[PDB]
Amino acid sequence: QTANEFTVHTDLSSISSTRAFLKEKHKAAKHIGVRADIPFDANQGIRLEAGFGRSKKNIINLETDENKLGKTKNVKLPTGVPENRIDLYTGYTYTQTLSDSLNFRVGAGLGFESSKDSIKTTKHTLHSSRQSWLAKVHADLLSQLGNGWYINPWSEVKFDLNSRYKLNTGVTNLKKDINQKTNGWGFGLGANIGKKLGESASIEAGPFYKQRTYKESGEFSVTTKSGDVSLTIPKTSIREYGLRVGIKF
């Protein structure tokens, strides 16, 4: 008597990272997701989400070992847009009717993000990884426009509780893998316009903007036949602009 709502969506976006050598920065990305909003007190609810995203990576070779070559200064040390990523989220929600035309919902919960990227170097094919446990808060408004039409501006903010960057370098004779804590945060903003058509079913669409940042890691070193070497995982800043299309059951 205040229904379960299930939304499946797809986004098409332009995503870019933080490159320091006049490179092409933009990548096409796509994400698919499902959200379940399940009421339990009918002011209060649970929100669950799962998602899967991809961007194409194009093979670009690099001349380095362990992944830091013959001379120290700066040249790898891979970060940027992930090739594949999955996200999961579970949280609680609270919804208030502001007027007969307007609903206000806020929520908070726990999220998990895991992504992978493949790197091909002369000697190796390495895989980088970013795995993050995070806290997320979200807020949105649902305003009725008439005839079943609605607009739904939304926002969310997240911050890492424990986010780690990994690179399977022990495979490229450092004999040791890289696993460094790299906490950050992110935010998202958008607005959907939709049409609630003939009971329980809605179609909606709208633009969105997202930003994700990971802080530079603490210092660490590795073992090279030609030495110890100092490494930092670089501050990483991702920006996404896109179009989301969703179906709400």
Ligand SMILES: [Zn+2]
């Ligand atoms: Zn570009």
Ligand SMILES: [Zn+2]
């Ligand atoms: Zn999405």
Ligand SMILES: [Zn+2]
């Ligand atoms: Zn090697």
